[PDB]
Design a protein around this nucleic acid. Structure first.
Lengths: 50, 180, 46, 104
DNA sequence: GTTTTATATACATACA
DNA sequence: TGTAGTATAAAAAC
C-alpha cells in the first residue's frame, strides 16, 4: 500500500535510478535468505519499480 | 494536418494548506526520499497514475510526469490523501497545471540550417552544442525543439490546445524545409 | 557455507576476547564470559 | 561511531538474547551488555569489511524503496540472488536495509 | 542545483 | 570492437 523474514543488512556506496530502473552498489553485509545466511564483500542490486 | 501531438508530461502545483514535518512524512509514506542535503523536500512516487511528487515543508506540492489533465489531478489528490492519512491537516486547494509537454513525428527529414536562417528571430541552432533547433513561437507562446529526423518536441503550454495550435502553425514551415 | 560460518566464528571469538577487559573492569567472572559465548553459539545454532 | 544495524542479523539477535538471559539470571548488568553490544557493532563492521570476499547480485522487482537519515531501505520481490566467490537462489520477498558507507 | 518528458549528438568507461 | 553514464537544450516548489 502507501503507508508504512529474508533480511539483508549492509552499507551502500551508491544508489542510482533511470526511469523505473534502480541500481545499488552495496558492501560489507550479511543476509538471511530462505533460512540460510550469507556474508558478502560486495553486492549489486538491479530492480525495476513497476 | 492529420497529425496530432502526443502529450508526454504535465506538471502541476497544489497547495495543501498546512506546514509539514518532512522527516515524519518520509518515515510514514512508502516510496519516499528525504535528503535535506540534496533538496529541501520529500520526493514521493506512486505507480498509478505513474508520477513523482515534490512535497515541501510549507505544504506546497509539485506533481510531475502525468500524461493527461485527469491523471495529473487524480495523482495530486492521491498524494494529498497519503499526507492526510499520515496525520496532517492537508487539503486540496488551488490545483493548477503549470506546464504541458507534447511530441510528434512528421515522418520526413528537416533542413534545420535553412529553417534557422529564414526564421532568425525565433530560432536558435548550434548543432555542436545541441542537435535540435530551438524555436520560440510567439502565438501561441510555445517552445519547440525541431530535429533533423522530423521528430518534434513542444513545451511551455498551460493547456493542451496550445500544443495543438503550435504544431498546426509550425507544420507548413517544416514542409517548406523538408530535406531532399 | 564456509565463508559465513567462518565469519560468524570470527565475530564470536573476537567479541568474547575484546570484552574481557570491560568484563574485568566490572569484575564479572571468567566463567560468566564463557557462558555468554556458549549461550550465544547455542542460540545461533538453534 | 559504528552503526547498530547488524544487531538485527541472526548473529546479532542471538547475542542480544544471550545477554538478556544473563541479565535475567542476575549475572551481568545492562550496562555491561551495552558495552558488549557496542563492541559487537565494531567487530561485525571490521569482519564484514576484512573477512569477506563473495559478491552477490540481486535482481527482481522493486516493490518499495525509501530513504531517510542516511539509510536506504528496499523491498525486492520475486528476485534471484547470485552468489559467487555457480549458486542461484530465488526469494519471494527480500528486505534490504543499507547505511551510508560514509558515516557521519 | 531537483523533478519530469519527448528529442539527439559527442564523449566517457565498463566487459566479454 | 561492438554492446551497454555524463554533458549539452518549459514550469512550479525550495
Amino acid at each position: 500500500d502507501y503507508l508504512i523474514e529474508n533480511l539483508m543488512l549492509c552499507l551502500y556506496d551508491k544508489v542510482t535510478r533511470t526511469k523505473a530502473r534502480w541500481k545499488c552498489s552495496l558492501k560489507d553485509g550479511v543476509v538471511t535468505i530462505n533460512r540460510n545466511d550469507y556474508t558478502f564483500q560486495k553486492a549489486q542490486v538491479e530492480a525495476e519499480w513497476v | 494536418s492529420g497529425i496530432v501531438p502526443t502529450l508526454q508530461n504535465i506538471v502541476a502545483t497544489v497547495t495543501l494548506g498546512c506546514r509539514l514535518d518532512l522527516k515524519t512524512v518520509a518515515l510514514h509514506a512508502r516510496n519516499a526520499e528525504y535528503n535535506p542535503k540534496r533538496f529541501a523536500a520529500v520526493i514521493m512516487r506512486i505507480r498509478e497514475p505513474k508520477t513523482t511528487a515534490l512535497i515541501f515543508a510549507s505544504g506546497k506540492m509539485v506533481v510531475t510526469g502525468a500524461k493527461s489533465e485527469d491523471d495529473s489531478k487524480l495523482a495530486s489528490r492521491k498524494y494529498a490523501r497519503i499526507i492526510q492519512k499520515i496525520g496532517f491537516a492537508a487539503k486540496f486547494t488551488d490545483f493548477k497545471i503549470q506546464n504541458i509537454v507534447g511530441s510528434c513525428d512528421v515522418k520526413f527529414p528537416i533542413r534545420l540550417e535553412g529553417l534557422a536562417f529564414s526564421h532568425g528571430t525565433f530560432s536558435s541552432y548550434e548543432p555542436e552544442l545541441f542537435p535540435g533547433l530551438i524555436y520560440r513561437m510567439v502565438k501561441p507562446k510555445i517552445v519547440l525543439l525541431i530535429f533533423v529526423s522530423g521528430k518534434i518536441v513542444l513545451t511551455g503550454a498551460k493547456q493542451r490546445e496550445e500544443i495543438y495550435q503550435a504544431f498546426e502553425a509550425i507544420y507548413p514551415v517544416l514542409s517548406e524545409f523538408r530535406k531532399m | 557455507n564456509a565463508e559465513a560460518s567462518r565469519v560468524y566464528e570470527i565475530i564470536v571469538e573476537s567479541v568474547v576476547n575484546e570484552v574481557r577487559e570491560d568484563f574485568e573492569n566490572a569484575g564479572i567472572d571468567e566463567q560468566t564470559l564463557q557462558d555468554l559465548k556458549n549461550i550465544w553459539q547455542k542460540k545461533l545454532t538453534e | 561511531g559504528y552503526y547498530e544495524l547488524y544487531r538485527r542479523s541472526t548473529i546479532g539477535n542471538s547475542l542480544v538474547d544471550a545477554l538478556d538471559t544473563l541479565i535475567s539470571d542476575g549475572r551481568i548488568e545492562a550496562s555491561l551488555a551495552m558495552r558488549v553490544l557496542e563492541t559487537f557493532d565494531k567487530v561485525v563492521a571490521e569482519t564484514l569489511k576484512d573477512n569477506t570476499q563473495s559478491k552477490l547480485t540481486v535482481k527482481g522487482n522493486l516493490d518499495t524503496y525509501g530513504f531517510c537519515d542516511d539509510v536506504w531501505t528496499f523491498i525486492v520481490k520475486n528476485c534471484q540472488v547470485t552468489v559467487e566467490d555457480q549458486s542461484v537462489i530465488s526469494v519471494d520477498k527480500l528486505r534490504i536495509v543499507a547505511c551510508n558507507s560514509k558515516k557521519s
